[PDB]
Amino acid sequence: DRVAASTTTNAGNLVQASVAPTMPVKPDFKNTDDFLSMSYRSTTAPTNPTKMVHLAHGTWTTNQHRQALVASITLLQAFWPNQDFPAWGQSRYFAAVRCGFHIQVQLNVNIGSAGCLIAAYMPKTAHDHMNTYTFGSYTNLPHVLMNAATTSQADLYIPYVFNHNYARTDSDDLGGIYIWVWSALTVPSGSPTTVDVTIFGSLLDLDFQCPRPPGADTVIYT
């Protein structure tokens, strides 16, 4: 009949006049199941939000000139805009993100077409103003050029880059990848005009902090 404390993750329990616990006869608390009824690895559940997901496809046609914008992605708000995405449910609690980013631009061009899209990365405080930047210089950014011919995929890794130490989930704070027309495509006839572009993203180095009520926004850095 003494003081018993109990602590799990955030919550904690300080009890007085405790009673010794009970357990069923011959208990076995080993978590894993052997033999296995599931082939998956038991670390799946926490790992799951890291899964790579289709993101914001766009359609790039003839008519669009240079400097035009094919598609747009707001980076940090991109992985859970809806309830459908895997990282949503667990991001609907914790209010901050230290996470790094992995985005793989998928593209398919029918052989015999020529032109280029550029996949760049613009952080938020940069993204605030397009009007300042010369177009010819966008290659200063972390980026990858994509040739129509002989490029299936463009793999670019983005480390966390932002002013404040931690960034708010529900906002745009990480900025986002914007895909621009480096040169117009050239189509011989007959060919399908629209060349579909799908930005197939991912996420790595998962982090969350600073609990909040499920639906409510909270200010942190400002």
Binding site: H54, H57, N110, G190, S191, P192, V195, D196, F200
Partner: protein, 48 residues
């Protein structure tokens, strides 16, 4: 039911003038490495 598999378009087929308009595809279910079968039993089917 063993569950759905869905096949959708990320990027539409891009066809050339020297290239076909649409392609024909095929699904195949190969049984796994470790797959056991159990407790043999008759069925009502004939010839199989």
């Amino acid at each position: 039911s063993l569950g759905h598999l869905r096949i959708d378009v990320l990027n539409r087929l891009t066809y050339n003038s020297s290239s076909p308009n649409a392609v024909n595809c095929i699904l195949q279910i190969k049984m796994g490495d470790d797959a056991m079968f159990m407790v043999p039993t008759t069925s009502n089917l004939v010839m199989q």
